[PDB]
Amino acid sequence: APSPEEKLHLITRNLQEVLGEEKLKEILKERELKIYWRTATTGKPHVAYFVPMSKIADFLKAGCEVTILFADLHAYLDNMKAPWELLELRVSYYENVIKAMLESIGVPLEKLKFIKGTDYQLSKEYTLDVYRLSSVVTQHDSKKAGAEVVKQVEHPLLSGLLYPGLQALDEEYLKVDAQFGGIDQRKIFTFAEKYLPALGYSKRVHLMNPMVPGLTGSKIDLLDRKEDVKKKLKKAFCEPGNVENNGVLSFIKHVLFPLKSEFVILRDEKWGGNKTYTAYVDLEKDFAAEVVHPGDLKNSVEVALNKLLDPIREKFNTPALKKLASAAYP
Amino acid sequence: APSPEEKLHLITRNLQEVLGEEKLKEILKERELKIYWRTATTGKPHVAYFVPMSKIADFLKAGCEVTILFADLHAYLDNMKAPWELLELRVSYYENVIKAMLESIGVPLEKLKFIKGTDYQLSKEYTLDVYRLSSVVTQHDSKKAGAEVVKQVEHPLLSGLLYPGLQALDEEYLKVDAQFGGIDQRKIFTFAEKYLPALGYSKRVHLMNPMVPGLTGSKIDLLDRKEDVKKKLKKAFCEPGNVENNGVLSFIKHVLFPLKSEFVILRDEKWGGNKTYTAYVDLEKDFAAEVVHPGDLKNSVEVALNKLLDPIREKFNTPALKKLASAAYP
């Protein structure tokens, strides 16, 4: 059972920024932290999705209650021509792939909750709060808050101005202590800290991951065959000695290293043989020194990534999920 | 029983503009017209309120179904410090004064319906439609539509951008054929004609009254004693021979003349004695010719207005309504 300090470390490791450390520590002295993470359901998740998922896994390992919101209302509003059933098929795909990813990482799911936006974002009390918020929030602040998150468009739509407030109110309605997301959500998060108190609701802790450079880029799909994973990785950019901007090193730092707090580099005996790193900074140092070659770095990632993907591919080859995957993406 | 032509005349007389004459005539060939009128519940109605009320009376006389929306949600949002019970007290005051006004005018109320905004404007289907609308309406169009109707303010609030869409959706949710209001609502009305079809809903007919100059202006309250009605009228501006901009003539044209399609001018025998006008243009002509003096015009209005107010004052002197009136305006 982790101490409050150990929980804090699991929760905050690899994050770019934490807002609300004071409250975060107060909570962890007494009880488990409750965390909300929002995901859109419009795309098709590729391996980059393991970056947020690795933090979700840390949260669960630390004993947190984690609520994942599947933003099905927004998915509908962003293309109302699409039928509610294909949209919900994609919601189901996301729910199942998230479960499979976390099972593969190896964390307890008892305190993981899935909720759909449509479950409550059209409810009476929530809607009244959306209106209350609209009566205190200036159009200027609404626009500013979504500047990095809302699609930049020809003539901006009214919906974009409403989105920051819905995401803030989610924190209250999901009854959480904190919201996690990427640092690109910072203005949405500061908006929530400013305006929730206007409605008599507490500001929340905010946990922000960095915007991590992609492993490749086509992209490696979560269900790509091992053959295609290999081929796509072979094409990945990875400059020798380059530690500042390196998608391969980033994937190790944020996804692979955290699994067991180690990473094995596969290397020919000629160049020193395999080495097991127990701190990421040690791997960074060797890569900068050019004694871990890009090809060996990529081979090491390929092996570990395929291990991570194996059980997911297995599960999605069952009749029910095989059908789901192809239907969700006809 | 009025013919379709007679109904059309009752419905459209004194209006500044009609949008949708084609559909209006089609409907009246077959059935009764259904009309929505919206009223805020934030002020305290004075005699100018008889201007819209006179059209409501015409609609009822013509056999129309009339739905009056009491905008209690907006009343709350415009001052959230105010308690829901004082707000609802004012709603009750408005409902009771409207009933008393129409009873005094003398029209059948069987097809008059009162509804509160909160009865449905927070409901699930309506809210989904608000979101759908926000996904097709540009921020630019939202702002433009409310330019004459939304309070011009320091830093404009998000709520102002939502208001035009709610008023459009009201037309669909109240299941009406037409919305009536002042010509200052024209941009809200054209917005509704443009955007309701985007959601698969029919555009409505729009009936627009002129912005009628006030009788005085303090203002004559609907419950002012006869003494104060007299005193306030004596102070009303009324330039001899001035027919273009004359609040006294406007009140005759829009409120008093329509009661029986006549108006009696009280005048000393010295100047020709009383005269009964059966067309407003005849009174206008005599006033322009300066053979109806401002003092006699005002005396004639005073007598007729006090007749209109008498039964209202009577009703509001009953214990229950006396209590309501003072509580609603503590």
Side-chain angles (χ1 to χ4, degrees):
Chain A
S3 68
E5 292 83 0
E6 291 167 330
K7 291 182 181 174
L8 179 70
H9 174 68
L10 277 171
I11 294 165
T12 64
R13 63 181 191 173
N14 277 164
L15 295 181
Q16 178 167 342
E17 184 179 5
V18 175
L19 289 172
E21 183 180 17
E22 178 174 359
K23 181 67 172 183
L24 177 56
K25 283 182 176 181
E26 289 182 347
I27 289 171
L28 293 174
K29 285 193 213 299
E30 297 187 46
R31 62 175 175 86
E32 309 288 12
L33 189 72
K34 301 180 243 253
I35 302 177
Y36 154 44
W37 176 62
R38 178 181 185 282
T39 181
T41 56
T42 48
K44 190 196 249 185
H46 42 278
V47 292
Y49 207 49
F50 271 109
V51 173
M53 213 55 54
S54 294
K55 286 314 301 179
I56 298 300
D58 284 354
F59 301 155
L60 292 167
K61 291 189 279 240
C64 299
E65 299 175 16
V66 177
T67 301
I68 299 180
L69 182 72
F70 298 79
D72 64 333
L73 173 59
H74 298 74
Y76 170 75
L77 295 174
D78 297 346
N79 188 5
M80 292 179 284
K81 302 308 185 61
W84 269 106
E85 297 84 356
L86 168 65
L87 295 175
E88 291 298 326
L89 240 26
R90 299 208 177 181
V91 170
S92 182
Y93 181 85
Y94 271 85
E95 291 188 356
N96 280 284
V97 313
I98 289 177
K99 184 170 175 52
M101 291 170 79
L102 291 166
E103 292 171 329
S104 181
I105 289 165
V107 294
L109 308 185
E110 281 89 352
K111 307 191 205 183
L112 176 62
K113 175 158 28 170
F114 290 169
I115 185 159
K116 298 180 194 168
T118 56
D119 289 339
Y120 70 93
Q121 289 177 330
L122 300 173
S123 70
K124 182 174 199 156
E125 298 177 18
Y126 182 92
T127 295
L128 182 52
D129 271 333
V130 169
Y131 288 127
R132 293 189 172 109
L133 206 48
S134 79
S135 303
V136 296
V137 175
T138 57
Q139 303 170 23
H140 176 77
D141 275 21
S142 302
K143 200 156 162 61
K144 179 170 72 174
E148 168 74 18
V149 148
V150 165
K151 52 121 150 155
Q152 161 75 359
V153 112
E154 311 89 25
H155 329 94
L157 296 170
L158 187 50
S159 58
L161 300 187
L162 294 170
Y163 289 170
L166 270 74
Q167 192 165 346
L169 288 167
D170 291 335
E171 296 178 1
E172 173 64 24
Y173 280 74
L174 301 177
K175 299 178 182 81
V176 300
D177 299 312
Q179 183 176 174
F180 162 70
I183 189 86
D184 65 341
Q185 314 241 213
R186 193 176 198 281
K187 292 176 175 167
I188 297 294
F189 290 175
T190 58
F191 175 98
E193 292 191 4
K194 175 185 180 67
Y195 289 109
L196 283 183
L199 268 53
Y201 298 139
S202 173
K203 76 171 175 175
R204 267 66 186 185
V205 170
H206 291 97
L207 307 172
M208 290 162 284
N209 238 8
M211 302 314 289
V212 171
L215 183 53
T216 68
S218 48
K219 293 309 210 293
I220 302 173
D221 184 68
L222 293 171
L223 264 33
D224 267 345
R225 320 246 165 186
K226 71 195 170 202
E227 295 78 16
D228 291 314
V229 171
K230 282 202 65 152
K231 136 180 155 28
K232 293 179 176 180
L233 265 175
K234 286 270 173 57
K235 292 164 46 172
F237 190 81
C238 189
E239 185 184 13
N242 184 345
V243 299
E244 289 299 341
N245 295 282
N246 189 320
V248 186
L249 282 174
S250 285
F251 196 82
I252 296 164
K253 184 178 190 283
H254 289 274
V255 177
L256 300 174
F257 190 96
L259 294 171
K260 294 174 56 174
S261 276
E262 71 176 34
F263 190 70
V264 177
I265 288 294
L266 305 173
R267 188 171 55 175
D268 293 343
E269 311 272 25
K270 177 176 183 180
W271 300 107
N274 291 359
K275 184 168 172 173
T276 300
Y277 296 87
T278 54
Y280 174 82
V281 60
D282 295 338
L283 170 60
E284 178 180 67
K285 182 173 179 298
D286 278 357
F287 194 83
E290 297 179 59
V291 305
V292 174
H293 303 157
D296 290 335
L297 192 74
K298 289 195 286 183
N299 188 41
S300 301
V301 168
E302 177 215 287
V303 172
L305 177 57
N306 268 324
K307 286 191 54 274
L308 205 50
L309 295 177
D310 278 337
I312 308 176
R313 294 188 289 235
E314 264 257 298
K315 280 158 179 175
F316 275 82
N317 233 285
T318 67
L321 293 176
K322 200 171 185 267
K323 160 71 95 59
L324 174 58
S326 75
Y329 303 94
Chain B
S3 68
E5 292 83 0
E6 291 167 330
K7 291 182 181 174
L8 179 70
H9 174 68
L10 277 171
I11 294 165
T12 64
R13 63 181 191 173
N14 277 164
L15 295 181
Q16 178 167 342
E17 184 179 5
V18 175
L19 289 172
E21 183 180 17
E22 178 174 359
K23 181 67 172 183
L24 177 56
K25 283 182 176 181
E26 289 182 347
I27 289 171
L28 293 174
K29 285 193 213 299
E30 297 187 46
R31 62 175 175 86
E32 309 288 12
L33 189 72
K34 301 180 243 253
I35 302 177
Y36 154 44
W37 176 62
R38 178 181 185 282
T39 181
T41 56
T42 48
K44 190 196 249 185
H46 42 278
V47 292
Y49 207 49
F50 271 109
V51 173
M53 213 55 54
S54 294
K55 286 314 301 179
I56 298 300
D58 284 354
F59 301 155
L60 292 167
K61 291 189 279 240
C64 299
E65 299 175 16
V66 177
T67 301
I68 299 180
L69 182 72
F70 298 79
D72 64 333
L73 173 59
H74 298 74
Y76 170 75
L77 295 174
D78 297 346
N79 188 5
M80 292 179 284
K81 302 308 185 61
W84 269 106
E85 297 84 356
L86 168 65
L87 295 175
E88 291 298 326
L89 240 26
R90 299 208 177 181
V91 170
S92 182
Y93 181 85
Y94 271 85
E95 291 188 356
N96 280 284
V97 313
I98 289 177
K99 184 170 175 52
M101 291 170 79
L102 291 166
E103 292 171 329
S104 181
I105 289 165
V107 294
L109 308 185
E110 281 89 352
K111 307 191 205 183
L112 176 62
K113 175 158 28 170
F114 290 169
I115 185 159
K116 298 180 194 168
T118 56
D119 289 339
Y120 70 93
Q121 289 177 330
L122 300 173
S123 70
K124 182 174 199 156
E125 298 177 18
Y126 182 92
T127 295
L128 182 52
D129 271 333
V130 169
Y131 288 127
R132 293 189 172 109
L133 206 48
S134 79
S135 303
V136 296
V137 175
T138 57
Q139 303 170 23
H140 176 77
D141 275 21
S142 302
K143 200 156 162 61
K144 179 170 72 174
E148 168 74 18
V149 148
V150 165
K151 52 121 150 155
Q152 161 75 359
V153 112
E154 311 89 25
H155 329 94
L157 296 170
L158 187 50
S159 58
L161 300 187
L162 294 170
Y163 289 170
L166 270 74
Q167 192 165 346
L169 288 167
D170 291 335
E171 296 178 1
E172 173 64 24
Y173 280 74
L174 301 177
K175 299 178 182 81
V176 300
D177 299 312
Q179 183 176 174
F180 162 70
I183 189 86
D184 65 341
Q185 314 241 213
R186 193 176 198 281
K187 292 176 175 167
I188 297 294
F189 290 175
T190 58
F191 175 98
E193 292 191 4
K194 175 185 180 67
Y195 289 109
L196 283 183
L199 268 53
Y201 298 139
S202 173
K203 76 171 175 175
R204 267 66 186 185
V205 170
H206 291 97
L207 307 172
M208 290 162 284
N209 238 8
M211 302 314 289
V212 171
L215 183 53
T216 68
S218 48
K219 293 309 210 293
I220 302 173
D221 184 68
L222 293 171
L223 264 33
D224 267 345
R225 320 246 165 186
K226 71 195 170 202
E227 295 78 16
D228 291 314
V229 171
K230 282 202 65 152
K231 136 180 155 28
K232 293 179 176 180
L233 265 175
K234 286 270 173 57
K235 292 164 46 172
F237 190 81
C238 189
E239 185 184 13
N242 184 345
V243 299
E244 289 299 341
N245 295 282
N246 189 320
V248 186
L249 282 174
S250 285
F251 196 82
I252 296 164
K253 184 178 190 283
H254 289 274
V255 177
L256 300 174
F257 190 96
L259 294 171
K260 294 174 56 174
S261 276
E262 71 176 34
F263 190 70
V264 177
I265 288 294
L266 305 173
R267 188 171 55 175
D268 293 343
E269 311 272 25
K270 177 176 183 180
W271 300 107
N274 291 359
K275 184 168 172 173
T276 300
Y277 296 87
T278 54
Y280 174 82
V281 60
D282 295 338
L283 170 60
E284 178 180 67
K285 182 173 179 298
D286 278 357
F287 194 83
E290 297 179 59
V291 305
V292 174
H293 303 157
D296 290 335
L297 192 74
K298 289 195 286 183
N299 188 41
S300 301
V301 168
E302 177 215 287
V303 172
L305 177 57
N306 268 324
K307 286 191 54 274
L308 205 50
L309 295 177
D310 278 337
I312 308 176
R313 294 188 289 235
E314 264 257 298
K315 280 158 179 175
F316 275 82
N317 233 285
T318 67
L321 293 176
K322 200 171 185 267
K323 160 71 95 59
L324 174 58
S326 75
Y329 303 94

